[PDB]
Amino acid sequence: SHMQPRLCYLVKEGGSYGFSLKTVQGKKGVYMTDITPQGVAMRAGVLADDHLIEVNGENVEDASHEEVVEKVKKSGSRVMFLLVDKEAAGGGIKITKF
Amino acid sequence: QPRLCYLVKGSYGFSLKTVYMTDITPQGVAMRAGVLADDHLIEVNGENVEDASHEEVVEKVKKSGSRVMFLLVDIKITKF
Amino acid sequence: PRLCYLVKEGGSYGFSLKTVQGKKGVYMTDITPQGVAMRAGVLADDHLIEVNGENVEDASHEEVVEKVKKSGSRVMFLLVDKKITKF
């Protein structure tokens, strides 16, 4: 659930990075999904429903699905992501103990 | 196994539930089109709706108006 | 709908209140195992409808916190627990 993002460096192997990018209804930017077991992404620390903040140092928080795909395709055989998890990417939560 | 159902309305006598059939009104058009409770919608008017949302499938049915066909059985994603 | 009458044990009721950005309502969370709230039948993600007979459906996190604080060592909740289109 952390407010400490992950830096994940992926090198393509066997023709695939082992992730898919999706959009989510009424949410900005793009998200990881379909993290293949033992694939490059899972091995690099990528998590399902991670939210992409940066691709190779470039902010993608406000980018379209297509923009991010292009950015990742332009990267070729290696790519770096700055990622925050599903819980960080959700709406803020206030909790008071009683 | 899949059935083709062609419904002519001014109501159809079924409800969509999340997509699935439900509220099949006794002796109505959907019931007598062959529609059964909890049918899974595979297609509407030839278009697959297996991965469709509730809203998407609702608008597709409203869009064909007074007549509709279902194939029944009793978001962007890019892969890298 | 459950009506729950809670009495503090060791200075705690064994629940926390939660609100989420984008979501209307105040909710129960963090129900301490075998605490007061758990023993009164309170459930995680219960939506608060009333506190001591005042509706709090439109109320802020902080309004509801104060309302619970103000009844002291006992408090009552009205609670409810956490698509079809016709053609």
PDB file of C-alpha atoms in Angstrom:
ATOM      1  CA  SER A   1       0.000   0.000   0.000  1.00  0.00           C
ATOM      2  CA  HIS A   2       3.080   2.195   0.150  1.00  0.00           C
ATOM      3  CA  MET A   3       3.648   5.847  -0.703  1.00  0.00           C
ATOM      4  CA  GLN A   4       7.192   4.782  -1.713  1.00  0.00           C
ATOM      5  CA  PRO A   5       7.233   4.074  -5.424  1.00  0.00           C
ATOM      6  CA  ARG A   6       9.170   1.232  -7.058  1.00  0.00           C
ATOM      7  CA  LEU A   7      11.827   1.647  -9.757  1.00  0.00           C
ATOM      8  CA  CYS A   8      11.655  -1.442 -12.031  1.00  0.00           C
ATOM      9  CA  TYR A   9      14.088  -2.079 -14.830  1.00  0.00           C
ATOM     10  CA  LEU A  10      12.931  -4.664 -17.339  1.00  0.00           C
ATOM     11  CA  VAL A  11      14.955  -6.347 -20.086  1.00  0.00           C
ATOM     12  CA  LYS A  12      12.789  -8.114 -22.669  1.00  0.00           C
ATOM     13  CA  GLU A  13      13.319 -11.875 -22.779  1.00  0.00           C
ATOM     14  CA  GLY A  14      11.682 -14.584 -24.868  1.00  0.00           C
ATOM     15  CA  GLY A  15       9.962 -11.878 -26.937  1.00  0.00           C
ATOM     16  CA  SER A  16       7.913 -10.488 -24.013  1.00  0.00           C
ATOM     17  CA  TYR A  17       8.087  -8.221 -20.959  1.00  0.00           C
ATOM     18  CA  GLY A  18       5.370 -10.219 -19.160  1.00  0.00           C
ATOM     19  CA  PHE A  19       2.943  -7.336 -18.500  1.00  0.00           C
ATOM     20  CA  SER A  20      -0.017  -5.666 -20.117  1.00  0.00           C
ATOM     21  CA  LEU A  21      -1.115  -2.036 -19.774  1.00  0.00           C
ATOM     22  CA  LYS A  22      -4.697  -1.143 -19.103  1.00  0.00           C
ATOM     23  CA  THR A  23      -7.025   1.700 -18.395  1.00  0.00           C
ATOM     24  CA  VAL A  24      -9.548   1.595 -15.483  1.00  0.00           C
ATOM     25  CA  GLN A  25     -13.015   3.325 -15.643  1.00  0.00           C
ATOM     26  CA  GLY A  26     -12.972   6.935 -14.383  1.00  0.00           C
ATOM     27  CA  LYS A  27      -9.242   6.775 -13.530  1.00  0.00           C
ATOM     28  CA  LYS A  28      -6.369   8.766 -15.061  1.00  0.00           C
ATOM     29  CA  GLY A  29      -3.325   7.278 -16.763  1.00  0.00           C
ATOM     30  CA  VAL A  30      -2.507   3.627 -17.063  1.00  0.00           C
ATOM     31  CA  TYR A  31      -2.072   0.563 -14.962  1.00  0.00           C
ATOM     32  CA  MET A  32      -0.247  -2.787 -15.006  1.00  0.00           C
ATOM     33  CA  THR A  33      -2.232  -5.969 -15.489  1.00  0.00           C
ATOM     34  CA  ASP A  34      -1.681  -9.591 -16.613  1.00  0.00           C
ATOM     35  CA  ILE A  35       1.672  -9.972 -14.896  1.00  0.00           C
ATOM     36  CA  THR A  36       2.719 -13.361 -16.255  1.00  0.00           C
ATOM     37  CA  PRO A  37       4.144 -15.732 -13.579  1.00  0.00           C
ATOM     38  CA  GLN A  38       7.985 -15.886 -13.802  1.00  0.00           C
ATOM     39  CA  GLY A  39       7.930 -13.223 -16.605  1.00  0.00           C
ATOM     40  CA  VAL A  40      10.331 -10.240 -16.842  1.00  0.00           C
ATOM     41  CA  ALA A  41       7.935  -7.823 -15.114  1.00  0.00           C
ATOM     42  CA  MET A  42       7.111 -10.095 -12.194  1.00  0.00           C
ATOM     43  CA  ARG A  43      10.848 -10.767 -11.725  1.00  0.00           C
ATOM     44  CA  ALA A  44      11.590  -7.028 -11.807  1.00  0.00           C
ATOM     45  CA  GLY A  45       9.055  -6.386  -8.954  1.00  0.00           C
ATOM     46  CA  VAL A  46       6.060  -5.221 -11.015  1.00  0.00           C
ATOM     47  CA  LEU A  47       2.623  -5.763  -9.400  1.00  0.00           C
ATOM     48  CA  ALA A  48      -0.888  -6.142 -10.839  1.00  0.00           C
ATOM     49  CA  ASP A  49      -2.834  -2.866 -10.787  1.00  0.00           C
ATOM     50  CA  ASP A  50       0.380  -0.865 -10.293  1.00  0.00           C
ATOM     51  CA  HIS A  51      -0.089   2.684 -11.586  1.00  0.00           C
ATOM     52  CA  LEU A  52       2.591   4.048 -13.982  1.00  0.00           C
ATOM     53  CA  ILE A  53       4.024   7.372 -12.867  1.00  0.00           C
ATOM     54  CA  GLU A  54       7.064   7.483 -15.195  1.00  0.00           C
ATOM     55  CA  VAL A  55       8.431   5.579 -18.190  1.00  0.00           C
ATOM     56  CA  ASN A  56      12.176   6.085 -18.578  1.00  0.00           C
ATOM     57  CA  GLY A  57      12.071   9.191 -16.415  1.00  0.00           C
ATOM     58  CA  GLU A  58       9.167  10.754 -18.332  1.00  0.00           C
ATOM     59  CA  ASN A  59       5.932  11.477 -16.389  1.00  0.00           C
ATOM     60  CA  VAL A  60       2.908   9.554 -17.765  1.00  0.00           C
ATOM     61  CA  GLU A  61       0.361  10.245 -14.984  1.00  0.00           C
ATOM     62  CA  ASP A  62      -1.777  12.390 -17.335  1.00  0.00           C
ATOM     63  CA  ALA A  63      -1.002  10.398 -20.549  1.00  0.00           C
ATOM     64  CA  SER A  64      -3.389   8.443 -22.759  1.00  0.00           C
ATOM     65  CA  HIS A  65      -3.201   4.698 -23.071  1.00  0.00           C
ATOM     66  CA  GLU A  66      -1.888   5.105 -26.654  1.00  0.00           C
ATOM     67  CA  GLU A  67       0.832   7.640 -25.607  1.00  0.00           C
ATOM     68  CA  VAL A  68       2.153   5.249 -22.984  1.00  0.00           C
ATOM     69  CA  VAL A  69       2.116   2.319 -25.405  1.00  0.00           C
ATOM     70  CA  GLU A  70       4.088   4.362 -27.927  1.00  0.00           C
ATOM     71  CA  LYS A  71       6.598   5.461 -25.211  1.00  0.00           C
ATOM     72  CA  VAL A  72       7.134   1.850 -24.195  1.00  0.00           C
ATOM     73  CA  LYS A  73       7.450   0.660 -27.820  1.00  0.00           C
ATOM     74  CA  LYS A  74      10.014   3.468 -28.501  1.00  0.00           C
ATOM     75  CA  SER A  75      12.093   2.090 -25.594  1.00  0.00           C
ATOM     76  CA  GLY A  76      12.802  -1.157 -27.550  1.00  0.00           C
ATOM     77  CA  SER A  77      14.208  -4.136 -25.663  1.00  0.00           C
ATOM     78  CA  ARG A  78      14.713  -2.459 -22.272  1.00  0.00           C
ATOM     79  CA  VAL A  79      12.335  -0.203 -20.255  1.00  0.00           C
ATOM     80  CA  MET A  80      12.318   1.479 -16.816  1.00  0.00           C
ATOM     81  CA  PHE A  81       9.121   2.233 -14.867  1.00  0.00           C
ATOM     82  CA  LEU A  82       8.418   4.273 -11.736  1.00  0.00           C
ATOM     83  CA  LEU A  83       5.361   2.555 -10.268  1.00  0.00           C
ATOM     84  CA  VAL A  84       3.062   3.000  -7.279  1.00  0.00           C
ATOM     85  CA  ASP A  85       0.724   0.198  -6.092  1.00  0.00           C
ATOM     86  CA  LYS A  86      -3.087  -0.125  -6.350  1.00  0.00           C
ATOM     87  CA  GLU A  87      -3.553   1.277  -2.859  1.00  0.00           C
ATOM     88  CA  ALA A  88      -1.410   4.404  -3.314  1.00  0.00           C
ATOM     89  CA  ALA A  89      -3.271   5.016  -6.661  1.00  0.00           C
ATOM     90  CA  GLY A  90      -6.690   4.902  -4.973  1.00  0.00           C
ATOM     91  CA  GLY A  91      -8.520   7.784  -3.319  1.00  0.00           C
ATOM     92  CA  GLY A  92      -7.116   8.979   0.024  1.00  0.00           C
ATOM     93  CA  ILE A  93      -8.395   7.441   3.255  1.00  0.00           C
ATOM     94  CA  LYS A  94      -8.970   9.022   6.643  1.00  0.00           C
ATOM     95  CA  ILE A  95      -9.245   6.731   9.611  1.00  0.00           C
ATOM     96  CA  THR A  96     -10.041   7.646  13.266  1.00  0.00           C
ATOM     97  CA  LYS A  97      -9.615   5.014  16.024  1.00  0.00           C
ATOM     98  CA  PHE A  98     -12.316   4.652  18.719  1.00  0.00           C
TER      99      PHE A  98
ATOM    100  CA  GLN B   1     -25.000 -24.944 -25.503  1.00  0.00           C
ATOM    101  CA  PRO B   2     -25.801 -21.675 -27.345  1.00  0.00           C
ATOM    102  CA  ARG B   3     -29.241 -20.503 -28.520  1.00  0.00           C
ATOM    103  CA  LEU B   4     -30.206 -17.676 -30.881  1.00  0.00           C
ATOM    104  CA  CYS B   5     -33.157 -15.650 -29.555  1.00  0.00           C
ATOM    105  CA  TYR B   6     -34.933 -12.995 -31.601  1.00  0.00           C
ATOM    106  CA  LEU B   7     -37.205 -10.682 -29.571  1.00  0.00           C
ATOM    107  CA  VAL B   8     -39.894  -8.292 -30.834  1.00  0.00           C
ATOM    108  CA  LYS B   9     -41.217  -5.832 -28.211  1.00  0.00           C
ATOM    109  CA  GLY B  10     -44.020  -2.145 -25.583  1.00  0.00           C
ATOM    110  CA  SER B  11     -41.605  -4.230 -23.480  1.00  0.00           C
ATOM    111  CA  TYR B  12     -39.305  -7.299 -23.892  1.00  0.00           C
ATOM    112  CA  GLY B  13     -40.018  -8.942 -20.515  1.00  0.00           C
ATOM    113  CA  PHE B  14     -36.436  -9.470 -19.286  1.00  0.00           C
ATOM    114  CA  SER B  15     -33.813  -7.506 -17.329  1.00  0.00           C
ATOM    115  CA  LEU B  16     -30.031  -7.363 -17.640  1.00  0.00           C
ATOM    116  CA  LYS B  17     -28.004  -8.193 -14.508  1.00  0.00           C
ATOM    117  CA  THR B  18     -24.279  -7.864 -13.605  1.00  0.00           C
ATOM    118  CA  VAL B  19     -23.894  -9.841 -18.357  1.00  0.00           C
ATOM    119  CA  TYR B  20     -26.837 -12.077 -17.528  1.00  0.00           C
ATOM    120  CA  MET B  21     -30.582 -12.381 -18.053  1.00  0.00           C
ATOM    121  CA  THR B  22     -32.921 -12.030 -15.063  1.00  0.00           C
ATOM    122  CA  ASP B  23     -36.576 -11.039 -14.263  1.00  0.00           C
ATOM    123  CA  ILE B  24     -37.944 -13.075 -17.225  1.00  0.00           C
ATOM    124  CA  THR B  25     -41.581 -12.044 -17.051  1.00  0.00           C
ATOM    125  CA  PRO B  26     -44.089 -14.990 -17.100  1.00  0.00           C
ATOM    126  CA  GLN B  27     -45.305 -15.873 -20.615  1.00  0.00           C
ATOM    127  CA  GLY B  28     -43.744 -12.670 -22.072  1.00  0.00           C
ATOM    128  CA  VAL B  29     -41.720 -12.131 -25.258  1.00  0.00           C
ATOM    129  CA  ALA B  30     -38.286 -13.150 -23.889  1.00  0.00           C
ATOM    130  CA  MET B  31     -39.715 -16.237 -22.151  1.00  0.00           C
ATOM    131  CA  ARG B  32     -41.399 -17.272 -25.430  1.00  0.00           C
ATOM    132  CA  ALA B  33     -38.340 -16.257 -27.517  1.00  0.00           C
ATOM    133  CA  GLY B  34     -36.525 -19.037 -25.626  1.00  0.00           C
ATOM    134  CA  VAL B  35     -34.833 -16.873 -22.959  1.00  0.00           C
ATOM    135  CA  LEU B  36     -34.191 -18.572 -19.603  1.00  0.00           C
ATOM    136  CA  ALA B  37     -33.302 -17.104 -16.172  1.00  0.00           C
ATOM    137  CA  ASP B  38     -29.548 -16.430 -15.759  1.00  0.00           C
ATOM    138  CA  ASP B  39     -28.632 -16.901 -19.438  1.00  0.00           C
ATOM    139  CA  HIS B  40     -25.140 -15.567 -20.178  1.00  0.00           C
ATOM    140  CA  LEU B  41     -25.112 -13.041 -23.030  1.00  0.00           C
ATOM    141  CA  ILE B  42     -22.460 -14.069 -25.539  1.00  0.00           C
ATOM    142  CA  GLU B  43     -23.592 -11.753 -28.333  1.00  0.00           C
ATOM    143  CA  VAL B  44     -26.046  -8.963 -29.013  1.00  0.00           C
ATOM    144  CA  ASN B  45     -26.879  -8.509 -32.709  1.00  0.00           C
ATOM    145  CA  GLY B  46     -23.748 -10.458 -33.767  1.00  0.00           C
ATOM    146  CA  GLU B  47     -21.327  -8.558 -31.545  1.00  0.00           C
ATOM    147  CA  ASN B  48     -19.592 -10.317 -28.708  1.00  0.00           C
ATOM    148  CA  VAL B  49     -20.349  -8.836 -25.269  1.00  0.00           C
ATOM    149  CA  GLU B  50     -18.541 -11.442 -23.072  1.00  0.00           C
ATOM    150  CA  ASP B  51     -16.084  -8.829 -21.889  1.00  0.00           C
ATOM    151  CA  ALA B  52     -18.682  -5.987 -22.141  1.00  0.00           C
ATOM    152  CA  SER B  53     -19.716  -3.820 -19.144  1.00  0.00           C
ATOM    153  CA  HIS B  54     -23.314  -3.321 -17.967  1.00  0.00           C
ATOM    154  CA  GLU B  55     -23.642   0.151 -19.559  1.00  0.00           C
ATOM    155  CA  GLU B  56     -22.088  -1.012 -22.869  1.00  0.00           C
ATOM    156  CA  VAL B  57     -24.517  -3.953 -23.175  1.00  0.00           C
ATOM    157  CA  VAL B  58     -27.486  -1.749 -22.133  1.00  0.00           C
ATOM    158  CA  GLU B  59     -26.814   0.833 -24.867  1.00  0.00           C
ATOM    159  CA  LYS B  60     -26.368  -1.920 -27.508  1.00  0.00           C
ATOM    160  CA  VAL B  61     -29.881  -3.278 -26.723  1.00  0.00           C
ATOM    161  CA  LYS B  62     -31.473   0.183 -26.576  1.00  0.00           C
ATOM    162  CA  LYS B  63     -29.719   0.899 -29.924  1.00  0.00           C
ATOM    163  CA  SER B  64     -31.465  -1.895 -31.829  1.00  0.00           C
ATOM    164  CA  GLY B  65     -34.814  -0.653 -30.522  1.00  0.00           C
ATOM    165  CA  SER B  66     -37.995  -2.654 -31.106  1.00  0.00           C
ATOM    166  CA  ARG B  67     -36.163  -5.812 -32.276  1.00  0.00           C
ATOM    167  CA  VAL B  68     -33.062  -7.561 -30.821  1.00  0.00           C
ATOM    168  CA  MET B  69     -31.099 -10.795 -31.224  1.00  0.00           C
ATOM    169  CA  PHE B  70     -29.129 -12.565 -28.521  1.00  0.00           C
ATOM    170  CA  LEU B  71     -26.726 -15.474 -28.488  1.00  0.00           C
ATOM    171  CA  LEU B  72     -27.224 -16.979 -25.039  1.00  0.00           C
ATOM    172  CA  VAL B  73     -25.769 -19.899 -23.059  1.00  0.00           C
ATOM    173  CA  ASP B  74     -27.907 -21.340 -20.200  1.00  0.00           C
ATOM    174  CA  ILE B  75     -11.301  -0.166 -21.299  1.00  0.00           C
ATOM    175  CA  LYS B  76      -8.113  -0.641 -23.293  1.00  0.00           C
ATOM    176  CA  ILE B  77      -5.607  -3.481 -22.717  1.00  0.00           C
ATOM    177  CA  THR B  78      -2.343  -3.946 -24.651  1.00  0.00           C
ATOM    178  CA  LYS B  79      -0.062  -6.922 -24.110  1.00  0.00           C
ATOM    179  CA  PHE B  80       3.754  -6.429 -23.947  1.00  0.00           C
TER     180      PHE B  80
ATOM    181  CA  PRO C   1     -30.150  -2.747   9.420  1.00  0.00           C
ATOM    182  CA  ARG C   2     -28.570  -3.239  12.824  1.00  0.00           C
ATOM    183  CA  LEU C   3     -28.924  -1.039  15.854  1.00  0.00           C
ATOM    184  CA  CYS C   4     -25.751  -1.349  17.993  1.00  0.00           C
ATOM    185  CA  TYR C   5     -25.342   0.072  21.524  1.00  0.00           C
ATOM    186  CA  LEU C   6     -21.653   0.222  22.447  1.00  0.00           C
ATOM    187  CA  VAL C   7     -20.145   0.652  25.885  1.00  0.00           C
ATOM    188  CA  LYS C   8     -16.375   1.407  26.157  1.00  0.00           C
ATOM    189  CA  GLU C   9     -14.075  -1.286  27.549  1.00  0.00           C
ATOM    190  CA  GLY C  10     -10.605  -0.097  28.565  1.00  0.00           C
ATOM    191  CA  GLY C  11     -11.211   3.279  26.924  1.00  0.00           C
ATOM    192  CA  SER C  12     -12.000   1.734  23.482  1.00  0.00           C
ATOM    193  CA  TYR C  13     -15.074   0.628  21.512  1.00  0.00           C
ATOM    194  CA  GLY C  14     -12.951  -1.623  19.221  1.00  0.00           C
ATOM    195  CA  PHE C  15     -13.801   0.157  15.917  1.00  0.00           C
ATOM    196  CA  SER C  16     -12.432   2.903  13.740  1.00  0.00           C
ATOM    197  CA  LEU C  17     -14.221   5.257  11.378  1.00  0.00           C
ATOM    198  CA  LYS C  18     -13.174   5.507   7.734  1.00  0.00           C
ATOM    199  CA  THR C  19     -13.974   7.856   4.880  1.00  0.00           C
ATOM    200  CA  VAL C  20     -12.648   7.615   1.325  1.00  0.00           C
ATOM    201  CA  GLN C  21     -12.055  10.440  -1.220  1.00  0.00           C
ATOM    202  CA  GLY C  22     -14.713  10.202  -3.909  1.00  0.00           C
ATOM    203  CA  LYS C  23     -17.070   8.041  -1.789  1.00  0.00           C
ATOM    204  CA  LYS C  24     -20.079   9.381   0.151  1.00  0.00           C
ATOM    205  CA  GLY C  25     -20.523   8.129   3.722  1.00  0.00           C
ATOM    206  CA  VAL C  26     -18.687   7.278   6.926  1.00  0.00           C
ATOM    207  CA  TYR C  27     -17.869   3.550   7.371  1.00  0.00           C
ATOM    208  CA  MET C  28     -16.694   1.189  10.106  1.00  0.00           C
ATOM    209  CA  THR C  29     -13.236  -0.328   9.825  1.00  0.00           C
ATOM    210  CA  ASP C  30     -10.550  -2.025  11.909  1.00  0.00           C
ATOM    211  CA  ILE C  31     -12.960  -3.987  14.121  1.00  0.00           C
ATOM    212  CA  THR C  32     -10.757  -5.195  16.982  1.00  0.00           C
ATOM    213  CA  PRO C  33     -11.133  -8.991  17.402  1.00  0.00           C
ATOM    214  CA  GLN C  34     -13.254  -9.757  20.466  1.00  0.00           C
ATOM    215  CA  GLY C  35     -13.656  -6.022  21.214  1.00  0.00           C
ATOM    216  CA  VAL C  36     -16.844  -4.209  22.048  1.00  0.00           C
ATOM    217  CA  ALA C  37     -17.887  -3.455  18.459  1.00  0.00           C
ATOM    218  CA  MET C  38     -17.233  -7.000  17.264  1.00  0.00           C
ATOM    219  CA  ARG C  39     -19.301  -8.332  20.214  1.00  0.00           C
ATOM    220  CA  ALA C  40     -22.192  -5.856  19.431  1.00  0.00           C
ATOM    221  CA  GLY C  41     -22.332  -7.213  15.829  1.00  0.00           C
ATOM    222  CA  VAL C  42     -20.501  -4.343  14.072  1.00  0.00           C
ATOM    223  CA  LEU C  43     -18.901  -5.326  10.732  1.00  0.00           C
ATOM    224  CA  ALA C  44     -16.036  -3.963   8.599  1.00  0.00           C
ATOM    225  CA  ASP C  45     -17.338  -1.566   5.929  1.00  0.00           C
ATOM    226  CA  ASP C  46     -20.671  -1.059   7.712  1.00  0.00           C
ATOM    227  CA  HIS C  47     -22.150   2.248   6.518  1.00  0.00           C
ATOM    228  CA  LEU C  48     -23.185   4.567   9.377  1.00  0.00           C
ATOM    229  CA  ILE C  49     -26.754   5.788   8.895  1.00  0.00           C
ATOM    230  CA  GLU C  50     -27.330   7.314  12.344  1.00  0.00           C
ATOM    231  CA  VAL C  51     -25.403   8.107  15.503  1.00  0.00           C
ATOM    232  CA  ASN C  52     -27.537   8.458  18.583  1.00  0.00           C
ATOM    233  CA  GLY C  53     -30.584   8.915  16.378  1.00  0.00           C
ATOM    234  CA  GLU C  54     -29.181  11.675  14.158  1.00  0.00           C
ATOM    235  CA  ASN C  55     -28.740  10.857  10.503  1.00  0.00           C
ATOM    236  CA  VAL C  56     -25.080  11.145   9.427  1.00  0.00           C
ATOM    237  CA  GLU C  57     -25.397  10.037   5.779  1.00  0.00           C
ATOM    238  CA  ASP C  58     -24.516  13.528   4.489  1.00  0.00           C
ATOM    239  CA  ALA C  59     -22.054  14.219   7.357  1.00  0.00           C
ATOM    240  CA  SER C  60     -18.289  14.802   7.211  1.00  0.00           C
ATOM    241  CA  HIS C  61     -15.710  12.447   8.735  1.00  0.00           C
ATOM    242  CA  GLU C  62     -14.991  15.073  11.390  1.00  0.00           C
ATOM    243  CA  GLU C  63     -18.690  15.762  12.177  1.00  0.00           C
ATOM    244  CA  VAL C  64     -19.276  12.079  12.840  1.00  0.00           C
ATOM    245  CA  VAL C  65     -16.089  11.750  14.958  1.00  0.00           C
ATOM    246  CA  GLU C  66     -17.331  14.614  17.186  1.00  0.00           C
ATOM    247  CA  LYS C  67     -20.822  13.159  17.446  1.00  0.00           C
ATOM    248  CA  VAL C  68     -19.383   9.843  18.748  1.00  0.00           C
ATOM    249  CA  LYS C  69     -16.941  11.668  21.094  1.00  0.00           C
ATOM    250  CA  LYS C  70     -19.777  13.732  22.542  1.00  0.00           C
ATOM    251  CA  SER C  71     -21.842  10.821  23.867  1.00  0.00           C
ATOM    252  CA  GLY C  72     -18.953   9.827  26.120  1.00  0.00           C
ATOM    253  CA  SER C  73     -18.659   6.212  27.309  1.00  0.00           C
ATOM    254  CA  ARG C  74     -21.715   4.808  25.463  1.00  0.00           C
ATOM    255  CA  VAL C  75     -22.829   5.305  21.822  1.00  0.00           C
ATOM    256  CA  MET C  76     -25.597   3.988  19.508  1.00  0.00           C
ATOM    257  CA  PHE C  77     -25.229   3.336  15.788  1.00  0.00           C
ATOM    258  CA  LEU C  78     -27.740   2.509  13.056  1.00  0.00           C
ATOM    259  CA  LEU C  79     -25.703   0.508  10.565  1.00  0.00           C
ATOM    260  CA  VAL C  80     -26.129  -1.063   7.185  1.00  0.00           C
ATOM    261  CA  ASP C  81     -23.753  -3.708   5.853  1.00  0.00           C
ATOM    262  CA  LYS C  82     -21.534  -3.219   2.794  1.00  0.00           C
ATOM    263  CA  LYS C  83     -26.940  -3.705 -11.395  1.00  0.00           C
ATOM    264  CA  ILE C  84     -30.290  -4.710 -12.909  1.00  0.00           C
ATOM    265  CA  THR C  85     -31.781  -2.847 -15.908  1.00  0.00           C
ATOM    266  CA  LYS C  86     -35.344  -3.581 -17.126  1.00  0.00           C
ATOM    267  CA  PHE C  87     -36.242  -3.869 -20.812  1.00  0.00           C
TER     268      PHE C  87
END
